[PDB]
Design an enzyme around this catalytic site. Structure first.
Site, short mmCIF file in Angstrom:
data_model
loop_
_atom_site.label_atom_id
_atom_site.label_comp_id
_atom_site.label_asym_id
_atom_site.label_seq_id
_atom_site.Cartn_x
_atom_site.Cartn_y
_atom_site.Cartn_z
CB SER A 41 -0.95 3.28 -2.41
OG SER A 41 -1.25 2.68 -3.66
CE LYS A 44 1.50 5.16 -4.98
NZ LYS A 44 0.11 4.71 -5.28
CD1 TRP A 76 -4.46 5.99 -8.22
CD2 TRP A 76 -6.36 6.37 -9.37
NE1 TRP A 76 -5.15 7.00 -7.59
CE2 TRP A 76 -6.32 7.25 -8.27
CE3 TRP A 76 -7.45 6.42 -10.24
CZ2 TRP A 76 -7.33 8.17 -8.01
CZ3 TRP A 76 -8.46 7.33 -9.98
CH2 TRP A 76 -8.39 8.20 -8.88
CG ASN A 103 -0.36 3.62 -8.86
OD1 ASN A 103 0.04 3.62 -7.69
ND2 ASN A 103 -1.47 3.00 -9.23
CD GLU A 139 4.17 -5.02 -11.40
OE1 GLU A 139 3.74 -5.04 -12.57
OE2 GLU A 139 4.70 -4.00 -10.88
CB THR A 206 -5.21 5.89 2.11
OG1 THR A 206 -5.03 6.48 0.82
CG2 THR A 206 -6.07 6.80 3.00
O1 LIG Z 1 -7.20 2.37 -4.10
C1 LIG Z 1 -6.30 2.46 -4.87
N1 LIG Z 1 -5.10 3.17 -4.44
C2 LIG Z 1 -5.02 3.75 -3.12
N2 LIG Z 1 -5.88 3.64 -2.12
N3 LIG Z 1 -5.45 4.37 -1.07
N4 LIG Z 1 -4.30 4.98 -1.47
N5 LIG Z 1 -4.07 4.58 -2.74
C3 LIG Z 1 -6.41 1.90 -6.30
N6 LIG Z 1 -7.80 1.61 -6.64
C4 LIG Z 1 -8.67 0.74 -5.84
C5 LIG Z 1 -9.89 1.23 -5.40
C6 LIG Z 1 -10.73 0.43 -4.64
C7 LIG Z 1 -10.35 -0.87 -4.32
C8 LIG Z 1 -9.13 -1.36 -4.76
C9 LIG Z 1 -8.30 -0.55 -5.52
C10 LIG Z 1 -5.54 0.67 -6.61
C11 LIG Z 1 -4.88 -0.01 -5.61
C12 LIG Z 1 -4.11 -1.12 -5.91
C13 LIG Z 1 -4.00 -1.55 -7.22
C14 LIG Z 1 -4.66 -0.87 -8.23
C15 LIG Z 1 -5.43 0.24 -7.92
#
Ligand SMILES: O=C(Nc1nnn[nH]1)[C@H](Nc1ccccc1)c1ccccc1
Ligand SMILES: O=C(Nc1nnn[nH]1)[C@H](Nc1ccccc1)c1ccccc1
Ligand SMILES: O=C(Nc1nnn[nH]1)[C@H](Nc1ccccc1)c1ccccc1
Length: 263
Positions: A41, A44, A76, A103, A139, A206
């Protein structure tokens, strides 16, 4: 000094990539800084910068409303799911993407920029030849070992972040807005911010792929009484089931120590 980072990544069970720049002296700390790591992510943040760049040629862009329905929602989407039908302004979507990693907001803004290739085009325009976004949420989080899709390097992330937050890549109003969005991020309290004293300002974005031990954070840090520091910390691990925050915080601590920054 590679020794502390090597011990940290061996304890972690994967690879840690760090690039940190003292914008005052020019001193740097580099460890695996030219290897590719999945953005997850963390793209972003650069997405919001690209939106701000577009605002330099499109008056009133940030306040333009975008309507969307349930079909635009992605897992999310903690902000955008609350503003359905009635929609959100471009600025609200950008803040949600940066500060909550929303997202649906990210995909909506990506669409306005022409998709992953459009964001990549913006990064090329500021001189970043390493960054590439290839896919959309979710994805882009596959984090497959050796896959260059949706990756950058810690060095390129830091260099581009510097240009956008402290350099001349954005005009002054847009630059300050980008900084303000990063400063208000809510998802990074256990990462770079955990290594930064409470009386220093910090903006960050992050990323967390959720597989292959893959997670990251990049930040601009304003110590008091000295020039800002820009840094990026990326991780990955060899096995799909490997887990990814304390390691990121520890790597940030080592980076600041390597720059001689008492904190
Ligand atoms: O952690 C996320 N997003 C993010 N983290 N930092 N910035 N954005 C989302 N949940 C998550 C939480 C803990 C462990 C793994 C995923 C997420 C990420 C990828 C796919 C689906 C959901
Ligand atoms: O802020 C701007 N432009 C600029 N400032 N510094 N460098 N460019 C203007 N965009 C803008 C975007 C969102 C909300 C309000 C204004 C603008 C764009 C194009 C023509 C005239 C004005
Ligand atoms: O749809 C709207 N506002 C509305 N809907 N129902 N009541 N007010 C649009 N404004 C808007 C502003 C902020 C966030 C979301 C939407 C709009 C108004 C006028 C012309 C074009 C678009």
């Amino acid at each position: 000094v590679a020794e502390p980072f090597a011990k940290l990544e061996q304890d972690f069970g994967g690879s840690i990539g760090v690039y940190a720049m003292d914008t005052g002296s020019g001193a740097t700390v580099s460890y695996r800084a030219e290897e590719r790591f999945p953005l997850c992510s963390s793209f972003k943040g650069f997405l919001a910068a690209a939106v701000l760049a577009r605002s330099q040629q499109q008056a009133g862009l940030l306040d333009t409303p975008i309507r969307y329905g349930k079909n635009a929602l992605v897992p999310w989407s903690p902000i955008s799911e609350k503003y359905l039908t009635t929609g959100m302004t471009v600025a609200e979507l950008s803040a949600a993407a940066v500060q909550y990693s929303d997202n649906a907001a990210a995909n909506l803004l990506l669409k306005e920029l022409g998709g992953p290739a459009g964001l990549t085009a913006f990064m090329r325009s500021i001189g970043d030849t390493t960054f590439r976004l290839d896919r959309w949420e979710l994805e882009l989080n596959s984090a497959i070992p050796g896959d260059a899709r949706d990756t950058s390097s810690p060095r390129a992330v830091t260099e581009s972040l510097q240009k956008l937050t402290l350099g001349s890549a954005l005009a002054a109003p847009q630059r300050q807005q980008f900084v303000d969005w990063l400063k208000g991020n809510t998802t990074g309290n256990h990462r770079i911010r955990a290594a930064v004293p409470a009386d220093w300002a910090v903006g960050d974005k992050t990323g967390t792929c959720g597989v292959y031990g893959t997670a990251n954070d990049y930040a601009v840090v304003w110590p008091t009484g000295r020039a800002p520091i820009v840094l990026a910390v990326y991780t990955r691990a060899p096995n799909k089931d490997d887990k990814h925050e304390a390691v990121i915080a520890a790597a940030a601590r080592l980076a600041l120590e390597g720059l001689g920054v008492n904190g």
